[PDB]
Design a protein around this ligand. Structure first.
Ligand SMILES: CC(C)CCC[C@@H](C)[C@H]1CC[C@H]2[C@@H]3CC=C4C[C@@H](O)CC[C@]4(C)[C@H]3CC[C@]12C
Ligand SMILES: CC(C)CCC[C@@H](C)[C@H]1CC[C@H]2[C@@H]3CC=C4C[C@@H](O)CC[C@]4(C)[C@H]3CC[C@]12C
Ligand SMILES: CC(C)CCC[C@@H](C)[C@H]1CC[C@H]2[C@@H]3CC=C4C[C@@H](O)CC[C@]4(C)[C@H]3CC[C@]12C
Ligand SMILES: CC(C)CCC[C@@H](C)[C@H]1CC[C@H]2[C@@H]3CC=C4C[C@@H](O)CC[C@]4(C)[C@H]3CC[C@]12C
Ligand SMILES: CCn1c(=O)c2c(nc(/C=C/c3ccc(O)c(O)c3)n2C)n(CC)c1=O
Ligand SMILES: CCCCCCCC/C=C\CCCCCCCC(=O)OC[C@H](O)CO
Ligand SMILES: CCCCCCCC/C=C\CCCCCCCC(=O)OC[C@H](O)CO
Ligand SMILES: CCCCCCCC/C=C\CCCCCCCC(=O)OC[C@H](O)CO
Ligand SMILES: CCCCCCCC/C=C\CCCCCCCC(=O)OC[C@H](O)CO
Ligand SMILES: CCCCCCCC/C=C\CCCCCCCC(=O)OC[C@H](O)CO
Ligand SMILES: CCCCCCCC/C=C\CCCCCCCC(=O)OC[C@H](O)CO
Ligand SMILES: CCCCCCCC/C=C/CCCCCCCC(=O)O
Ligand SMILES: CCCCCCCC/C=C\CCCCCCCC(=O)O
Ligand SMILES: CCCCCCCC/C=C\CCCCCCCC(=O)O
Ligand SMILES: CCCCCCCC/C=C\CCCCCCCC(=O)O
Ligand SMILES: CCCCCCCC/C=C\CCCCCCCC(=O)O
Ligand SMILES: CCCCCCCC/C=C\CCCCCCCC(=O)O
Ligand SMILES: CCCCCCCC/C=C\CCCCCCCC(=O)O
Ligand SMILES: CCCCCCCC/C=C\CCCCCCCC(=O)O
Ligand SMILES: CCCCCCCC/C=C\CCCCCCCC(=O)O
Ligand SMILES: CCCCCCCC/C=C\CCCCCCCC(=O)O
Ligand SMILES: CCCCCCCC/C=C\CCCCCCCC(=O)O
Ligand SMILES: CCCCCCCC/C=C\CCCCCCCC(=O)O
Ligand SMILES: CCCCCCCC/C=C\CCCCCCCC(=O)O
Ligand SMILES: CCCCCCCC/C=C\CCCCCCCC(=O)O
Ligand code: NA
Length: 383
């Protein structure tokens, strides 16, 4: 069959993906610019991620359509159009890792987050990561390429001029670079790091949620211990356990009343006044109902919002892996199994197309999972 037919389907699908990648991610950038509730450090990496996907539609996809034709070109110019998508994918990996690390700092040290993670430091990390993405993605342009050994038979059959090659990805970009350097070192290792960070985020959140329910249980159990105590020394022991727990959960008016009321009951318990200490300890229930339960449920609601936001960011990282892994796995078969027939052209186009679809998916995940984004999208679209 004429090459231009299956080429037309591939190119048409690519152009459709490019249109969707630009539109959805311009909408993400417009939402962050317009809404100050979306202007935080986490979303500055989201915007950098969206900028990379905009460039996938504007440059990488036109480059991919070009490289698929095998047109005659100077080898190093062919190398650039083949490698620029590697820059954008690397930038995405840095942004995804930074988002995960940012959410871990928020869940692990919320007391120092605003002092450690600032907009100025975020903007500098983003600039550094873009420079490193160019260095990693364009490493073949520094000499690790196949331009020294061109397929002159393919170039002559295409009528290419002197110094030109049939511009094809696997003819200019070495497979050992794509497998060992790009996939294993620069893609697989950071994704595995992302997985570990997310595991530590969800483990820390589960630990802090368990600690809240434990402190709540310890407060109410020691309440009953005081109620059914038989001597003043037992009430003293239980109150000492409540006071240490009250200060640990405090690390404002409700806790000042709570600790003060415990100190009251502990003073009577030291004097041997058991029924006076028990009666004073009963006043803690009034403080617990009016103040302590409100703090526990607000902290619980805040921790669950962080789990929800971390799940949304993990889905984004997972979809990046799902969309990009098939192409990388095919490269592994090409490189590691020279006795295996090369994957057919239609599967390569499908794997290339699938990797490009990742540039479309993030704006949907924000709209479906983040209310502030969804509402800002609606306002932008409606107006
Ligand atoms: C500001 C942005 C949009 C600039 C985009 C510039 C792009 C489109 C330019 C910059 C470098 C260019 C390449 C440089 C060299 C060659 C080798 C030549 O034999 C064929 C064209 C080719 C392969 C060019 C294609 C177009 C190219 C990739
Ligand atoms: C917006 C500004 C900063 C653009 C900076 C990037 C420019 C300078 C880069 C991007 C791609 C580059 C080209 C990539 C490949 C080739 C083909 C090679 O045989 C000669 C150099 C040449 C032609 C490069 C010249 C410099 C180049 C055009
Ligand atoms: C992340 C998950 C969803 C990836 C799915 C795995 C994909 C990429 C795997 C599963 C089966 C694999 C194929 C199995 C057999 C062959 C025949 C061989 O001659 C070339 C490679 C080829 C054609 C493989 C290409 C990669 C492949 C299509
Ligand atoms: C944690 C997971 C997702 C890491 C990614 C798995 C990758 C590295 C694995 C999954 C399946 C593997 C392939 C399975 C089968 C073969 C055929 C053999 O003749 C050479 C190795 C080769 C081509 C393997 C290379 C490595 C491979 C592509
Ligand atoms: C992730 C980087 N990357 C790649 O790794 C890649 C690739 N395009 C191919 C392969 C194309 C091909 C292979 C055999 C053929 O006969 C043919 O006509 C075309 N690969 C292996 N691009 C798309 C431009 C790409 O972005
Ligand atoms: C071809 C051009 C090369 C692309 C390099 C610059 C791309 C992006 C940074 C813009 C997003 C920064 C916003 C973070 C806040
Ligand atoms: C808007 C779009 C440009 C439409 C795509 C034009 C790109 C030229 C494709 C082409 O020339 O044919 C493909 C290849 O040669 C066949 O094997
Ligand atoms: C905003 C910027 C938008 C402008 C970008 C230009 C649009 C497209 C790709 C360039 C068109 C491809 C060049 C045509 C190649 C040609 O003329 O044919 C060569 C022939 O096959 C043998 O020499
Ligand atoms: C923001 C602005 C949007 C950026 C525009 C990107 C459009 C196209 C990339 C096309 C790459 C150049 C196409 C190759 C045409 C060509 O040079 O082929 C002629 C002949 O083969 C040479 O010897
Ligand atoms: C900072 C690194 C910039 C390094 C300068 C990039 C020049 C790469 C180059 O042109 O080298 C051609 C050839 O591929 C080499 O073996
Ligand atoms: C985790 C990635 C580890 C996967 C590394 C597996 C490499 C595959 C391999 O070594 O295959 C070579 C084969 O022996 C050639 O004949
Ligand atoms: C191909 C991989 C290339 C590796 C190059 C290694 C260089 C990485 C450099 C570290 C970035 C640190 C930037 C600090 C600049 C000053 C910022 C400041 O004022 O503290
Ligand atoms: C819908 C987008 C269609 C764009 C036209 C692509 C025609 C296919 C081709 O150029 O070979
Ligand atoms: C290539 C296309 C990239 C453009 C995408 C950027 C989208 C919006 C950037 C944020 C808004 C820019 C300034 C808005 C001016 C204003 O206040 O009205
Ligand atoms: C290159 C592609 C577009 C880059 C757009 C940068 C986003 C502009 C808005 C910045 C912000 O949301 O604060
Ligand atoms: C914002 C603009 C986005 C890109 C606009 C251009 C759209 C066209 C997309 C790819 C053009 C590929 C050109 C074909 C290469 C030459 C084929 C050949 O000479 O054999
Ligand atoms: C060829 C690239 C080799 C490796 C380059 C190393 C990366 C250094 C890039 C420039 C850093 C410029 C930004 C530093 C200022 C902001 C730092 C910050 O606020 O944390
Ligand atoms: C080596 C690097 C070659 C040139 C690449 C330039 C890197 C992109 C520059 C900085 C991006 C700024 C992000 C916005 C803050
Ligand atoms: C960013 C890292 C380096 C990019 C260097 C681009 C290579 C220059 C063109 C190669 C050539 O002239 O043959
Ligand atoms: C981290 C996950 C990937 C780690 C590296 C796996 C490297 C396996 C060694 C390749 C052996 C292939 C060979 O020697 O032919
Ligand atoms: C093979 C690496 C998998 C990459 C996905 C890890 C990032 C998010 C994980 C799930 C939570
Ligand atoms: C699901 C999308 C369709 C791709 C399905 C699986 C591809 C793997 C099966 C191998 C395809 C044929 C390869 C061959 O003939 O050697
Ligand atoms: C989402 C998953 C991808 C979206 C839809 C993918 C549909 C087909 C991609 C085009 C693949 C080209 C197949 C024909 C090319 C050929 O005959 O060699
Ligand atoms: C094919 C064109 C792109 C398809 C995108 C499918 C996934 C998008 C979000 C739902
Ligand atoms: C290819 C992947 C396509 C999209 C799957 C996830 C999109 C669903 C939006 C919620
Ligand atoms: Na991306």
């Amino acid at each position: 069959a004429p090459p231009i037919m299956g080429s037309s389907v591939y190119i048409t699908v690519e152009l459709a993906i490019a249109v969707l990648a630009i539109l959805g991610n311009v909408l993400v950038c417009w939402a962050v610019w317009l809404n100050s509730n979306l202007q935080n450090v986490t979303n500055y990496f989201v915007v950098s991620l969206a900028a990379a996907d905009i460039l996938v539609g504007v440059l990488a996809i036109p480059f991919a359509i070009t490289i698929s034709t095998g047109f005659c070109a100077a080898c190093h110019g062919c190398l650039f159009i083949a490698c620029f998508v590697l820059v954008l994918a690397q930038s995405s990996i840095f942004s995804l890792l930074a988002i995960a690390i940012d959410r871990y700092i928020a869940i692990a040290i919320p007391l120092r987050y605003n002092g450690l993670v600032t907009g100025t430091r975020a903007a500098g990390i983003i600039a550094i990561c873009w420079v490193l993405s160019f260095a990693i993605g364009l490493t073949p342009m520094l000499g690790w390429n196949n331009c020294g050994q061109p397929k002159e038979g393919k170039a002559h059959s295409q009528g290419c001029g002197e110094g030109q090659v049939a511009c094809l990805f696997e003819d200019v970009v070495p497979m050992n670079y794509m497998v060992y350097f790009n996939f294993f070192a620069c893609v697989l290792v950071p994704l595995l790091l992302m997985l570990g960070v997310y595991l530590r985020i969800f483990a820390a959140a589960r630990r802090q949620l368990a600690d809240l329910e434990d402190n709540w249980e310890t407060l109410n159990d020691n309440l009953k211990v005081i109620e059914k105590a038989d001597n003043a020394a037992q009430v003293k022991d239980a109150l000492t356990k409540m006071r240490a727990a009250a200060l640990d959960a405090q690390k404002r008016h409700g806790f000042d009343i709570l600790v003060g009321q415990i100190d009251d009951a502990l003073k009577l318990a030291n004097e041997g006044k058991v029924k006076e200490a028990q009666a004073a300890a009963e006043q803690l229930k009034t403080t617990r109902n009016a103040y302590i339960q409100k703090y526990l449920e607000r902290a619980r609601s805040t921790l669950q919002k962080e789990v929800h936001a971390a799940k949304s960011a993990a889905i984004i990282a997972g979809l990046f892996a799902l969309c990009w892994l098939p192409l990388h796995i095919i490269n592994c078969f090409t490189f590691f199994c020279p006795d295996c027939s090369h994957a057919p052209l239609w599967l390569m186009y499908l794997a290339i197309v699938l990797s490009h679809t990742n540039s479309v998916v993030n704006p949907f995940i924000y709209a479906y999972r983040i209310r502030e984004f969804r509402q800002t999208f609606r306002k932008i679209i409606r107006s």
